[PDB]
């Protein structure tokens, strides 16, 4: 629900964000959106070749937690994994966000 | 629904 928050896309479901992201993002394009399985967190959809990747972002008491990792904003997450692998494969495959779907 | 592991920190 997030005014006045450009890192929000919206309340899409998971199915409608793959949607969204197979038909008008790029591999690195993401949107943050409600999560629809714990509904006060957040997710991180990223389009990925293959398949689509999903990561968890729990709001704790003002605090962005993914991971091990935690965040004053969200915005200060996302600047985050633009420059360190927000997903790594067993074969050393990294992947980054670089930037929102519209 | 499940989520994908994030990189390891």
Known sequence: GPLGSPWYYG?????????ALNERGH?????????????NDFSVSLKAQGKNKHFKVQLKETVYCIGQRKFST????????????????????????????? | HIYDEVAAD
Do not use: C, N, W
Request: a negative charge.
């Open chain 1, 11 to 19: 309340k899409v479901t998971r199915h409608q964000a793959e949607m």
């Open chain 1, 27 to 39: 591999e690195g394009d993401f949107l943050i959106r409600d999560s629809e399985s714990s509904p």
């Open chain 1, 74 to 102: 969200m915005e200060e997450l996302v600047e985050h994994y633009k420059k360190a692998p927000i997903f790594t494969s067993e074969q050393g495959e990294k992947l980054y966000l670089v930037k929102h779907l519209s």
